[PDB]
């Protein structure tokens, strides 16, 4: 009774408005890069249940990075990694933990909202840019497209899976 538009193959693109990508994660490492190289970078790394703290490194936006990680879950954790200039550095801005392992983005607004928390109970929140028009993503697993109309079967996939 319910039909899904997907899934998508990994791709690089600018999404559209108004519609939510509600990408599957497959996987340890990263799971998305988004820009628009000006005043938005988000990345998205995903750490395994279970895993003590230790080094590992990521290639974000074509450069190596080093981050030291921890999850002490039984969940997939996706860590959001956000720098909001060219030279400034990435910091954890926000963080999903889901064994659902799917995350979303919407460009909304003049701002582009993702889901953060804990599943079954993760809300949207969001992050303000000046050029929502130019933020380019890079997608390493499968997705699926769910119009902004639709949000509420994007949230219950998120939290209760897909």
């Given at each position: 009774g319910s039909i899904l538009d997907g899934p998508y193959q990994p791709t690089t693109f600018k999404p559209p408005?108004?519609?939510?990508?509600?990408?599957?994660?497959?996987?340890?490492?990263?799971?998305?890069?988004?820009?628009?190289?000006?005043?938005?970078?988000?990345?998205?790394?995903?750490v395994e249940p279970h895993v003590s703290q230790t080094n590992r490194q990521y290639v974000l936006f074509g450069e190596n990075k080093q981050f030291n990680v921890e999850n002490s879950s039984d969940k997939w954790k996706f860590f959001e990694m956000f720098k909001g200039s060219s030279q400034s550095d990435f910091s954890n801005?926000?963080?999903?933990?889901?064994?659902?392992?799917?995350?979303?983005?919407?460009?909304?607004?003049?701002?582009?909202?993702?889901?953060?928390?804990?599943?079954?109970?993760?809300?949207?929140?969001?992050?303000?840019?000046?050029?929502?028009?130019?933020?380019?993503?890079?997608?390493?697993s499968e997705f699926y497209i769910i119009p902004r109309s639709q949000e509420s079967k994007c949230n219950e996939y998120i939290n209760n899976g897909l």
């Open positions: 408005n108004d519609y939510w990508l509600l990408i599957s994660s497959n996987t340890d490492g990263v799971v998305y890069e988004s820009t628009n190289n000006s005043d938005f970078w988000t990345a998205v790394i995903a801005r926000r963080t999903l933990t889901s064994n659902n392992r799917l995350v979303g983005m919407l460009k909304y607004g003049g701002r582009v909202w993702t889901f953060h928390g804990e599943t079954p109970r993760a809300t949207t929140d969001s992050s303000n840019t000046a050029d929502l028009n130019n933020i380019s993503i890079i997608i390493h």
